[PDB]
Coordinates of C-alpha atoms in Angstrom, one line a residue:
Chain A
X1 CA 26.7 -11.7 2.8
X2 CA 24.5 -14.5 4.5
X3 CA 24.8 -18.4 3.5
X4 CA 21.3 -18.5 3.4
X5 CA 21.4 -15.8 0.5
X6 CA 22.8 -18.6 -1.6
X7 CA 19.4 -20.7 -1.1
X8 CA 17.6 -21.7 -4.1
X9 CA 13.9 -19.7 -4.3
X10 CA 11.6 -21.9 -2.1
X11 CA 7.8 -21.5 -2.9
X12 CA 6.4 -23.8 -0.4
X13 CA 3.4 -26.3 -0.2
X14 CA 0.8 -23.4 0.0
X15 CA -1.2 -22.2 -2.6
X16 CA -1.0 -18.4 -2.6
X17 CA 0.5 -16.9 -5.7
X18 CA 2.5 -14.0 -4.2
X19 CA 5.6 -11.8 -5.0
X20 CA 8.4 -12.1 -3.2
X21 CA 12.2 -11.3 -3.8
X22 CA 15.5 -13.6 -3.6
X23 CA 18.9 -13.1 -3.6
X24 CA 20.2 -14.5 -7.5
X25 CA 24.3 -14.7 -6.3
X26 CA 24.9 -16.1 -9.7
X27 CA 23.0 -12.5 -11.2
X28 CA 24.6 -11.0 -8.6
X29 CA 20.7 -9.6 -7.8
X30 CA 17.9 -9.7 -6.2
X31 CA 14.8 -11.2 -8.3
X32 CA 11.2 -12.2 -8.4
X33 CA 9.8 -15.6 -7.4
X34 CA 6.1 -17.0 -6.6
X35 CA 5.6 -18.0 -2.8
X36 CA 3.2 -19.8 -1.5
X37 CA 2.5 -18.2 1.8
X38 CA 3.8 -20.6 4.0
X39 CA 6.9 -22.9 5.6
X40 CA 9.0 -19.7 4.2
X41 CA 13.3 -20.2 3.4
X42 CA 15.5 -17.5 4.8
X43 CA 15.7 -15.9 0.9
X44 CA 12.5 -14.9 0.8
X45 CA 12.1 -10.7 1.1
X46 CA 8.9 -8.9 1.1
X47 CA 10.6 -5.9 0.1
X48 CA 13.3 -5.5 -2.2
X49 CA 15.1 -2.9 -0.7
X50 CA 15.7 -5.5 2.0
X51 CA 16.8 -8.1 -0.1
X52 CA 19.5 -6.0 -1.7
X53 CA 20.5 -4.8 1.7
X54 CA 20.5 -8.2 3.2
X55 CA 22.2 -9.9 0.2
X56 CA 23.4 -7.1 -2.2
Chain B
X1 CA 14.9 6.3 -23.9
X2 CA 16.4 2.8 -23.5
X3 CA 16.5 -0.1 -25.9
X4 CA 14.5 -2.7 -23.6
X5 CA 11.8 0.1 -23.8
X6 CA 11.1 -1.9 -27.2
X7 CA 10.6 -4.9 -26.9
X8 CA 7.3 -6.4 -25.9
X9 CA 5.5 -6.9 -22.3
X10 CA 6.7 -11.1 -21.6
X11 CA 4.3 -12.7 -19.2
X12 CA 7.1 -15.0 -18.5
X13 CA 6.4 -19.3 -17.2
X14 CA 5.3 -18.6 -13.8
X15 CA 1.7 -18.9 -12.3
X16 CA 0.7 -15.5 -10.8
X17 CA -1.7 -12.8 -12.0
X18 CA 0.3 -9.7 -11.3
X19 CA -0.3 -6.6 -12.4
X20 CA 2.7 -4.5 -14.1
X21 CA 3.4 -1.4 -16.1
X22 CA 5.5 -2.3 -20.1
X23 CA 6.2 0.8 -22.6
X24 CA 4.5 0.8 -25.3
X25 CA 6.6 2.2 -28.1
X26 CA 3.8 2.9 -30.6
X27 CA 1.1 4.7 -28.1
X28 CA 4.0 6.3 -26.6
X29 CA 2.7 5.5 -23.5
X30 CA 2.8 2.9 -20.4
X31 CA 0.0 0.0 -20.3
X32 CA -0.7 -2.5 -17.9
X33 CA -0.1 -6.6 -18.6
X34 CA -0.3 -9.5 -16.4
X35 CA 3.0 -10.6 -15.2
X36 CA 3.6 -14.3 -13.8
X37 CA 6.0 -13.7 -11.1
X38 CA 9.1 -14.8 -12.4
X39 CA 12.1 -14.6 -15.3
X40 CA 10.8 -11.0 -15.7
X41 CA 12.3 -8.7 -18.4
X42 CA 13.7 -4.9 -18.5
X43 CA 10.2 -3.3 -20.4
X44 CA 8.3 -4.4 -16.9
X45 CA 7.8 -2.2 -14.0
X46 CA 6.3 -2.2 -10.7
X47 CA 5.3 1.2 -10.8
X48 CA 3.7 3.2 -13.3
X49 CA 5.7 6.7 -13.0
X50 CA 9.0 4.5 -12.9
X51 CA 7.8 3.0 -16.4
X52 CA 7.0 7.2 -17.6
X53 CA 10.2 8.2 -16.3
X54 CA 12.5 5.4 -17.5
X55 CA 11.2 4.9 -21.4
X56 CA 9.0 8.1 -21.5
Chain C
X1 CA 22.6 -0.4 -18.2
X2 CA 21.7 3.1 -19.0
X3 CA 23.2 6.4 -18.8
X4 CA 21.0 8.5 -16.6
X5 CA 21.9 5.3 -14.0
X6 CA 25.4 7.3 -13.7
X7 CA 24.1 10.2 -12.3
X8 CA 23.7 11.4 -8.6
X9 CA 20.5 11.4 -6.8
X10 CA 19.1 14.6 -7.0
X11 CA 16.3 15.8 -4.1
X12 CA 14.8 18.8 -6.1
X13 CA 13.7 22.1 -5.2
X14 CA 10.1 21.0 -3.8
X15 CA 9.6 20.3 0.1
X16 CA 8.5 17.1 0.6
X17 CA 10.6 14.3 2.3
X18 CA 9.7 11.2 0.3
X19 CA 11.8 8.4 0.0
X20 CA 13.3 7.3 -3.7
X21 CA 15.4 4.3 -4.4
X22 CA 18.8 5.4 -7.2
X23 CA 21.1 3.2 -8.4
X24 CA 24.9 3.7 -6.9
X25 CA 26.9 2.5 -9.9
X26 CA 30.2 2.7 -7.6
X27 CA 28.5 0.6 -4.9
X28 CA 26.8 -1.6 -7.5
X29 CA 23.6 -1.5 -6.2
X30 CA 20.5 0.6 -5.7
X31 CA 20.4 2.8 -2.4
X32 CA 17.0 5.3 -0.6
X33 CA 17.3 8.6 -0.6
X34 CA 14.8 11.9 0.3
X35 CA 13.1 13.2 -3.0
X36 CA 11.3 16.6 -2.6
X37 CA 8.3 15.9 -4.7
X38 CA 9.2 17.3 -8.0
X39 CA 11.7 17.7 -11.0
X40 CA 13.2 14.3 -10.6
X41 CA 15.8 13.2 -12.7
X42 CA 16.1 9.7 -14.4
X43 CA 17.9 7.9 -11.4
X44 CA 14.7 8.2 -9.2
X45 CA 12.8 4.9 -9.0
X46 CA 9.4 4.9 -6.2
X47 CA 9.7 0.6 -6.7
X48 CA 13.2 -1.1 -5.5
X49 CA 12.4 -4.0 -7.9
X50 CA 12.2 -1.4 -11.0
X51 CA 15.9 0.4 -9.6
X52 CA 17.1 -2.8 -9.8
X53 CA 16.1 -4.5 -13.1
X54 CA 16.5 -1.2 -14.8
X55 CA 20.3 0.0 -13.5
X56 CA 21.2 -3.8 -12.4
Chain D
X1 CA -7.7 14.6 -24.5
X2 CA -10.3 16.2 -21.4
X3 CA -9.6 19.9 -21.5
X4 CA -8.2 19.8 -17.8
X5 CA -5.1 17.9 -18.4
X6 CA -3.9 21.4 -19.7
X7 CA -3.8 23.4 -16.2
X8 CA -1.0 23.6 -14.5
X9 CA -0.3 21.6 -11.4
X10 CA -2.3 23.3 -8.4
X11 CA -0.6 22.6 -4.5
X12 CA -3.4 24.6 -2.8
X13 CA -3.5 26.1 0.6
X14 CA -3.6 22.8 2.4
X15 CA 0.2 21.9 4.3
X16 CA 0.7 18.2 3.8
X17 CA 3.2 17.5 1.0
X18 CA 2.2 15.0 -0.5
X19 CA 2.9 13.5 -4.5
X20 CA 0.5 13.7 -7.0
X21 CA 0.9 13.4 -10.9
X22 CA -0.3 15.8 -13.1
X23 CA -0.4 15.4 -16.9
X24 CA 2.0 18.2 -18.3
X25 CA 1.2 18.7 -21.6
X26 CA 4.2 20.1 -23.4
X27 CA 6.7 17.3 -22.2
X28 CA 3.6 14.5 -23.6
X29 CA 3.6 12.7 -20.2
X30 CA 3.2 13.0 -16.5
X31 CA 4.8 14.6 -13.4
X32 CA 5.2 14.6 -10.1
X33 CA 4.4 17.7 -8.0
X34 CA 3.6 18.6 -4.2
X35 CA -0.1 18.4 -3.2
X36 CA -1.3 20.1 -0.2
X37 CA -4.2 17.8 0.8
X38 CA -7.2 20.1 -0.2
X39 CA -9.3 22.3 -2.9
X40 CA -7.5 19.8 -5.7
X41 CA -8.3 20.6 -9.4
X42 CA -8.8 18.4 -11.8
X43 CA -5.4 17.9 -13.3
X44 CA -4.2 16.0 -10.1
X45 CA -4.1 11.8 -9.7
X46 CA -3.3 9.6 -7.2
X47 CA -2.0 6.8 -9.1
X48 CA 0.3 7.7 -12.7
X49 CA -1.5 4.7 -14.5
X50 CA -4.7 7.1 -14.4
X51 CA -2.9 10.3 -15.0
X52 CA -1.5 8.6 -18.5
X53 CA -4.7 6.9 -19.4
X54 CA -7.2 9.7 -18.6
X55 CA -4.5 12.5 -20.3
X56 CA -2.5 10.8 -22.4
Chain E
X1 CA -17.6 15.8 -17.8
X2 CA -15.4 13.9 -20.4
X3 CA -17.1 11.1 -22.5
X4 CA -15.3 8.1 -22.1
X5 CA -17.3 8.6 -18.5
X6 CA -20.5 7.2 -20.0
X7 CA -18.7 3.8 -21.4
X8 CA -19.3 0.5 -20.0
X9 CA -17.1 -1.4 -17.7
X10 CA -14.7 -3.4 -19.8
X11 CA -12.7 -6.3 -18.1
X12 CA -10.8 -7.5 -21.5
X13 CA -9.1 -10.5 -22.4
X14 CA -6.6 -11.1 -19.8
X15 CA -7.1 -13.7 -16.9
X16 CA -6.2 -11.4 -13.8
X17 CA -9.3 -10.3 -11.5
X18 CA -7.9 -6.9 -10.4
X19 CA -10.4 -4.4 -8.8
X20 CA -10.2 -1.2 -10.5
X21 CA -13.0 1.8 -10.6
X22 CA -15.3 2.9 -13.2
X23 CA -17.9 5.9 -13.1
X24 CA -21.2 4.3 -13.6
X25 CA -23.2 7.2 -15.2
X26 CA -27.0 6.7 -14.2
X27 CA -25.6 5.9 -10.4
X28 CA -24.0 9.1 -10.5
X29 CA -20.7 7.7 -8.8
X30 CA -17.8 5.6 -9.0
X31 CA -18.0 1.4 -8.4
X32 CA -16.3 -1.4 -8.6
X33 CA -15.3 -3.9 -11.2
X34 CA -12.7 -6.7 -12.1
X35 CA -10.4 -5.9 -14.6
X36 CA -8.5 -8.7 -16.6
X37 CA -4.8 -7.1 -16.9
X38 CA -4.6 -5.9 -20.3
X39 CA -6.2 -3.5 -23.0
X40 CA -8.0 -1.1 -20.3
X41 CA -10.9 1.4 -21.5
X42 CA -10.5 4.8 -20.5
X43 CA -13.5 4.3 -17.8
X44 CA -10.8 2.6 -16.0
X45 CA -9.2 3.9 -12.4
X46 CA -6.6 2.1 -10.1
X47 CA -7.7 5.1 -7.5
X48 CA -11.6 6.1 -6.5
X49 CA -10.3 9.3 -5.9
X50 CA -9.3 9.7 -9.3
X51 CA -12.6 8.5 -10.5
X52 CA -14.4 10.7 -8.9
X53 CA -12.3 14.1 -9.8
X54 CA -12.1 12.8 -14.0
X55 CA -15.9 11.4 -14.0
X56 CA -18.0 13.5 -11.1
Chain F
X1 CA -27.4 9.4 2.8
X2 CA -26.2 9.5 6.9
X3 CA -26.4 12.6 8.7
X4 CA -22.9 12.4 9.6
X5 CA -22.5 13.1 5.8
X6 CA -23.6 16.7 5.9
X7 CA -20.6 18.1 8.9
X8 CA -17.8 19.9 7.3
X9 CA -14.0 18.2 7.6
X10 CA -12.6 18.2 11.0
X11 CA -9.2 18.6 11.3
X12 CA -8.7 17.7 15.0
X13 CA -5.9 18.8 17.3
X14 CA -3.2 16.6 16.4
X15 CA 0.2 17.2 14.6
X16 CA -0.4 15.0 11.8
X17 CA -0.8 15.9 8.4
X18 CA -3.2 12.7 6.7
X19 CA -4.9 13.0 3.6
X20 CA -8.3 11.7 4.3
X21 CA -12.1 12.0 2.7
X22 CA -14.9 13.8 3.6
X23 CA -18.1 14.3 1.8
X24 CA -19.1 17.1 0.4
X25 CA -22.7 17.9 -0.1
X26 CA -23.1 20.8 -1.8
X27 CA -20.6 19.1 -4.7
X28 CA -22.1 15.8 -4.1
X29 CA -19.0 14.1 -4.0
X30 CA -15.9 13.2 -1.6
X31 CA -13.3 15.6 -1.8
X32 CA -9.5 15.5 0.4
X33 CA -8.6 17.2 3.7
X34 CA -5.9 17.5 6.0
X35 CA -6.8 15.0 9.4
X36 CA -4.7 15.5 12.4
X37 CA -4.4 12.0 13.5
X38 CA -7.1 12.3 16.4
X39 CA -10.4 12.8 17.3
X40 CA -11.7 11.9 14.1
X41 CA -15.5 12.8 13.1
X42 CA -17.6 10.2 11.2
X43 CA -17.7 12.2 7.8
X44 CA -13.9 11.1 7.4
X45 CA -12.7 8.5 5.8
X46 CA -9.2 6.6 5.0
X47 CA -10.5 5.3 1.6
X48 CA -12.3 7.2 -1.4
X49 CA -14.6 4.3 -2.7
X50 CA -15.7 4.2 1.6
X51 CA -16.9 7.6 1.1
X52 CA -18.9 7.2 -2.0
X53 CA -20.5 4.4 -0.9
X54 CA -21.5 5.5 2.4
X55 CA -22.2 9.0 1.8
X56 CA -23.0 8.7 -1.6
Chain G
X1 CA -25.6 4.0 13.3
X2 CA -27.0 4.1 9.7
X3 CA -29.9 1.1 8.5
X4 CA -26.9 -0.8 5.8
X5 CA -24.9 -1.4 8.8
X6 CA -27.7 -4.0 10.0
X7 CA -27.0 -5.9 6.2
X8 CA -25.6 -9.2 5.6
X9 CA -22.4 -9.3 4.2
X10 CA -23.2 -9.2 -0.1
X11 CA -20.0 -11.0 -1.9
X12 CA -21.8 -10.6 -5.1
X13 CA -21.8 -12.4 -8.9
X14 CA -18.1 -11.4 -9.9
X15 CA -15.0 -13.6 -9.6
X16 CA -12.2 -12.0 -7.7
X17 CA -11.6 -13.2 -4.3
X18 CA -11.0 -9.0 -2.3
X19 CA -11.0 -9.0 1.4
X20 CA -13.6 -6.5 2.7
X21 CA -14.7 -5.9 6.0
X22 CA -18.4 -4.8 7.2
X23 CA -20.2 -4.6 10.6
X24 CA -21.4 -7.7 12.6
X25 CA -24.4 -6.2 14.4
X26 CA -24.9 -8.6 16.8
X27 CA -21.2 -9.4 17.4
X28 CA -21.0 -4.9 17.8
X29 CA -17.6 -4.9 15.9
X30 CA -16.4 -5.4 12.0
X31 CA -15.3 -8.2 10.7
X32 CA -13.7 -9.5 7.3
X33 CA -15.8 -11.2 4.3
X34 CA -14.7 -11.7 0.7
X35 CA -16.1 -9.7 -2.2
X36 CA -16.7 -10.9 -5.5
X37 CA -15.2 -7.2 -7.0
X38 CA -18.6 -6.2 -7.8
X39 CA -22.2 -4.7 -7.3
X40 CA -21.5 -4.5 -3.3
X41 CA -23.9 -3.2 -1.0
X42 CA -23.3 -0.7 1.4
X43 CA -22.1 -2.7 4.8
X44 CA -18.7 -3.2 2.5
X45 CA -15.8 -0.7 3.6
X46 CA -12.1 -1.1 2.1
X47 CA -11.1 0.1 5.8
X48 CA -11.5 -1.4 9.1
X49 CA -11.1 2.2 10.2
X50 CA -14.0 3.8 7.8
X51 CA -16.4 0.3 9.5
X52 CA -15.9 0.5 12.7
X53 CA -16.3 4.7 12.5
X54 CA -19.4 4.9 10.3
X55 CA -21.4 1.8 11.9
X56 CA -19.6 1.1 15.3
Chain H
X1 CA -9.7 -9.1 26.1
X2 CA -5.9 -8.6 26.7
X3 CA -5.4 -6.0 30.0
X4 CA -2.9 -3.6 27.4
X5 CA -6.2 -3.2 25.4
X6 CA -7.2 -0.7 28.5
X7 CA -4.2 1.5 28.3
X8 CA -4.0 4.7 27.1
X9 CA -2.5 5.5 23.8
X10 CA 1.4 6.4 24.1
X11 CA 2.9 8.4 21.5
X12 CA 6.7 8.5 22.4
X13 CA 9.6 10.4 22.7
X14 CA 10.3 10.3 18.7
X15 CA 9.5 12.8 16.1
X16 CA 7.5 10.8 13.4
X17 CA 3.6 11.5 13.5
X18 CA 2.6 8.3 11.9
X19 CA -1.0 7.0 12.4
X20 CA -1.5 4.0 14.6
X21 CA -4.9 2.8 16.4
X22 CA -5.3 1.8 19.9
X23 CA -8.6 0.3 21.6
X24 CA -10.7 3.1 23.4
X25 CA -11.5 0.5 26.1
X26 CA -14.9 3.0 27.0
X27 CA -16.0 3.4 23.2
X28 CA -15.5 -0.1 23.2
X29 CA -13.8 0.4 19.8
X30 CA -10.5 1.0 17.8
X31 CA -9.6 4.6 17.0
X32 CA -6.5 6.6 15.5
X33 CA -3.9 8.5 17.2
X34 CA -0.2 9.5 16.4
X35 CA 2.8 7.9 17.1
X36 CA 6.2 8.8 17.4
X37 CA 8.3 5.8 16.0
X38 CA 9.7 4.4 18.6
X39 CA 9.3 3.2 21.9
X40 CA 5.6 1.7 21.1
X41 CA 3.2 -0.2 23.8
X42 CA 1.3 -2.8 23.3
X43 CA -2.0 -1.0 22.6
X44 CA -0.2 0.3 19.0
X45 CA -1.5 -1.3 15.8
X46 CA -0.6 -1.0 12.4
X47 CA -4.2 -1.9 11.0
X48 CA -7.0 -1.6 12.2
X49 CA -8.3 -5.0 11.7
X50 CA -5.6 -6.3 14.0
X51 CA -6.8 -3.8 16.4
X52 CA -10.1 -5.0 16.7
X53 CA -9.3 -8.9 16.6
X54 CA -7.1 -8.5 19.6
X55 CA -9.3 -6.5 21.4
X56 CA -12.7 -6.4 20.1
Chain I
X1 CA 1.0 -12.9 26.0
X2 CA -2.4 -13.4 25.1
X3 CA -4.1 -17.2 25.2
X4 CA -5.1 -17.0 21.7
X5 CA -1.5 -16.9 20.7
X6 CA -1.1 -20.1 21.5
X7 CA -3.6 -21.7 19.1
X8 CA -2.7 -22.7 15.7
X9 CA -3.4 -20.5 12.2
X10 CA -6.7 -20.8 10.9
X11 CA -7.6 -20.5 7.0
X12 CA -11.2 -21.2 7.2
X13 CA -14.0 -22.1 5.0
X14 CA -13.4 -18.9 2.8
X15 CA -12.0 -19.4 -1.0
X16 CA -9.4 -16.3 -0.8
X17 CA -5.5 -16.8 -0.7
X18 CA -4.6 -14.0 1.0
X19 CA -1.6 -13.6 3.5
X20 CA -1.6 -13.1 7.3
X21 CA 0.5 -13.6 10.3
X22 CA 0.6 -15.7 13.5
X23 CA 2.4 -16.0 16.1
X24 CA 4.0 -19.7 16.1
X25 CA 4.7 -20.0 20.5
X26 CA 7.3 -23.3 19.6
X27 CA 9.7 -21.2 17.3
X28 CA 9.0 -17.8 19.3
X29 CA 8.2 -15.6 16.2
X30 CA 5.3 -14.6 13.8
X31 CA 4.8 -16.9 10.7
X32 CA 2.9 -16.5 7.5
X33 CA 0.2 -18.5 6.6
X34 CA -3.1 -18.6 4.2
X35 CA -6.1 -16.9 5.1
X36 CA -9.6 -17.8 3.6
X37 CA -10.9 -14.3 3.6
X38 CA -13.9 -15.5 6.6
X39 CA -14.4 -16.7 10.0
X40 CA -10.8 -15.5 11.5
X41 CA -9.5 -16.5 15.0
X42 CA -7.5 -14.3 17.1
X43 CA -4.0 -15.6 16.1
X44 CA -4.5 -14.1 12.9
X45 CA -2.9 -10.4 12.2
X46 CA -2.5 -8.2 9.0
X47 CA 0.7 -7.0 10.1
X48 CA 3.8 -8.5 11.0
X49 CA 4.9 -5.9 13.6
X50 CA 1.3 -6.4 15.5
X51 CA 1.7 -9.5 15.9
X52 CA 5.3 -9.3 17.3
X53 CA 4.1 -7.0 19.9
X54 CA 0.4 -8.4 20.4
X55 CA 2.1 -12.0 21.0
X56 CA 6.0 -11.5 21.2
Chain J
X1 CA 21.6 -15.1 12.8
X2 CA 24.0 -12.2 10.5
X3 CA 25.9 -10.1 12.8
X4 CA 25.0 -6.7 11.3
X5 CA 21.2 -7.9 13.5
X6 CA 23.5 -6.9 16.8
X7 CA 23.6 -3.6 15.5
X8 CA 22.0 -0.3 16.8
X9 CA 19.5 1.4 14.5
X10 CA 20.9 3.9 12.7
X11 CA 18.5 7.2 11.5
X12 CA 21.3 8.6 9.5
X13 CA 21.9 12.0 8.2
X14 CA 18.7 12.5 6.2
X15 CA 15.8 15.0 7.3
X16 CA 12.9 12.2 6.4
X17 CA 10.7 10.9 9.1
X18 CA 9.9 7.3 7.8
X19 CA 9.7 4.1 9.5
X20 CA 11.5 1.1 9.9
X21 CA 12.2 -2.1 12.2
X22 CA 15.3 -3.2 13.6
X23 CA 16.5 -6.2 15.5
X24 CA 16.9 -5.8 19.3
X25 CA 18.9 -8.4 20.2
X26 CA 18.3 -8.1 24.2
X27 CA 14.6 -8.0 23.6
X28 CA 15.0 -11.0 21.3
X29 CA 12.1 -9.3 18.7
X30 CA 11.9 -6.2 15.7
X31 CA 10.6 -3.2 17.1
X32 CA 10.4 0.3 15.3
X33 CA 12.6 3.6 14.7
X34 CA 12.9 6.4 12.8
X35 CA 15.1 6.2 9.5
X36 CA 16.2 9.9 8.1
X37 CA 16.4 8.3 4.1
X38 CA 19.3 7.7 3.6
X39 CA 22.7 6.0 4.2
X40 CA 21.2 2.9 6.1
X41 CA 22.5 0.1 7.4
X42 CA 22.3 -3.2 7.5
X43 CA 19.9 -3.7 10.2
X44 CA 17.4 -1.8 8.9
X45 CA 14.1 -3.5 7.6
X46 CA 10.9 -1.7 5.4
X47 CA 9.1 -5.1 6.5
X48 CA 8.6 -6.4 10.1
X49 CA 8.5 -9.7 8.0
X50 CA 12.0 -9.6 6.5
X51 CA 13.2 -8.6 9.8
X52 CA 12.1 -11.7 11.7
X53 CA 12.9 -14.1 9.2
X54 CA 16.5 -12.6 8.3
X55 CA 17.2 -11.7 12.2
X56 CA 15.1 -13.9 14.5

């Protein structure tokens, strides 16, 4: 898998409270987070099918 | 039906007003709740015929 | 995790190609498949995030 | 309970296949089933949260 | 058509604003409302469609 | 209430099979149909609570 | 084109913050506005497709 | 207005029939035709409210 | 590609938090951003994908 | 960027017509095929989003 799937969620300085997905490699899973909408991190999925994919 | 099907719908810490689907063991049916985006638990789905299929 | 997360993705006898997300105990994770529309089994999840959280 | 949520699921002549719950009665919740995209009867929703809420 | 048609709106106690449908009686057809998240009516419906099928 | 509102459902020549909304007048409300994909007339639309509204 | 096409855009007295599009007369195309999630007018379409075919 | 906003739609050597929109350059307004999948030009959009932005 | 790629996002005076999409020329790919709900410019898309082909 | 992004898309064995982005490496951008449902791989993306971010 991707180094970036080891990333820490990253909401952002925007203020949008929206879904998104990361990749938890210590829960060996992909998990919810709030994002702000902008200055998005590599581990940030719109889908989770992707995120398992990516990551998984 | 699963266990986690039992336990109550947790809003969780996070900010967001999300709408998601918990069983509810006594109506014997699913109900809505607002999730906050994050630390979620197993009696909380994304879809209402997932939460039918799952615990009904 | 529950039982029904053991069994194999079943399409149905109904026409329609719609995808489905089941979890794949052997590969760990939750995979697509085509769903016909009716007489799904308990492995048959329409959200990724609900596959996941349920058989993860 | 409306009276309706007792017929059985109805496809119609229409050929799209598309999925639709329906409340079925004997099993206490609701189903998928294969809509043909026209003359619907009553016992038909788009979304499940309706189909348990108006039925069940 | 079934009685729970003729209720009032009812946002409840929850602090989402959600749109969801409701079949206004004297109108004669479905509208719009914010709904909080939690303890829905029946007069409730995530899909206009489904409004107008129960209600109409 | 438009004109527009009173012309049956118009399929079109495409391959497509869309679930769409017309109005029905003689029901007085907005029923499905099967749209092609082109050549759309104006009593179609892509969302339910569009239909009401306009033709309503 | 019908008479509610020539409306302002109406956000109305409720509090939800929905993206909705209706017809800009004098700029002959629809455009987005934000809905309050209830008592809209008529120039308010949940599809760019259903404004730009009903008023354009 | 972009010069890809005058071409005509192109549907593709794949086998989907997906809805897209492309700008009717004489209409002077976005409309719906099918797509194939693959192999898209630039007059292709998702929404519609994209397709009217770009070349309204 | 199009002038109005090269201009910056624009939220606008609008109170929504909604998620768009433009197209960012110095890192040569579509970026998220917040969206007011009102007053868009033309670097502003719905979907990911039409941006990517309006601008890419 | 991951090396699965280099890859070809791959439809796959299942009869579904759905569709998805994939990363052309010579055109530098995501661009669309046709998925069958089932047995994906990696460079397959349900969001034009995901596919920038994780492949751009």
């Amino acid at each position: 898998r991707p180094d970036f799937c080891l990333e820490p969620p990253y909401t952002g300085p925007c203020k949008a409270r929206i879904i998104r997905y990361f990749y938890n490699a210590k829960a060996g899973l992909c998990q919810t987070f709030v994002y702000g909408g902008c200055r998005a991190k590599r581990n940030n999925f719109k889908s989770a099918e992707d995120c398992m994919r990516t990551c998984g």
